[PDB]
Design a protein around this ligand. Structure first.
Ligand code: NA
Length: 129
């Protein structure tokens, strides 16, 4: 599923992300825009052979099992395929675990480089929320 901007904001808010660990909803929508262009089925292979999955490009090195990332962990206890569903539930819930682990949203490179310190509210402007 490919979401509209406001459409995904509304879905993320439904699933408990708005101000989760002090991170406003705009932060989450901005991260998703630059990670996946709002596509639940986005995948990208990393140089170490791990792969990032879904709307927030969660990494099989630590957070899910895909069967082709040797010596990795599965801290969200899920197959990586779970992070590609039209239903954003598994991605939101594993993201809550990642952002709560010490490094906050700096875990997401696109967030650090393109959203952090920006006017992230723009990302929810015009959305019925
Ligand atoms: Na893994």
């Amino acid at each position: 599923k490919v979401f509209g901007r406001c459409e995904l904001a509304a879905a993320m808010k439904r699933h408990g992300l708005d101000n989760y660990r002090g991170y406003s909803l705009g932060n989450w929508v901005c991260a998703a825009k630059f990670e996946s262009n709002f596509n639940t089925q986005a995948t990208n292979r990393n140089t170490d052979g791990s792969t990032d999955y879904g709307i927030l490009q969660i990494n099989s090195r630590w957070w899910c099992n895909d069967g082709r990332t040797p010596g990795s962990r599965n801290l969200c206890n899920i197959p990586c395929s779970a992070l590609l569903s039209s239903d954003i539930t598994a991605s939101v819930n594993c993201a809550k675990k990642i952002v709560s682990d010490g490094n906050g949203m700096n875990a997401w490179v696109a967030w650090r480089n393109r959203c952090k310190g920006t006017d992230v509210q723009a990302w929810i402007r015009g959305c019925r929320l």
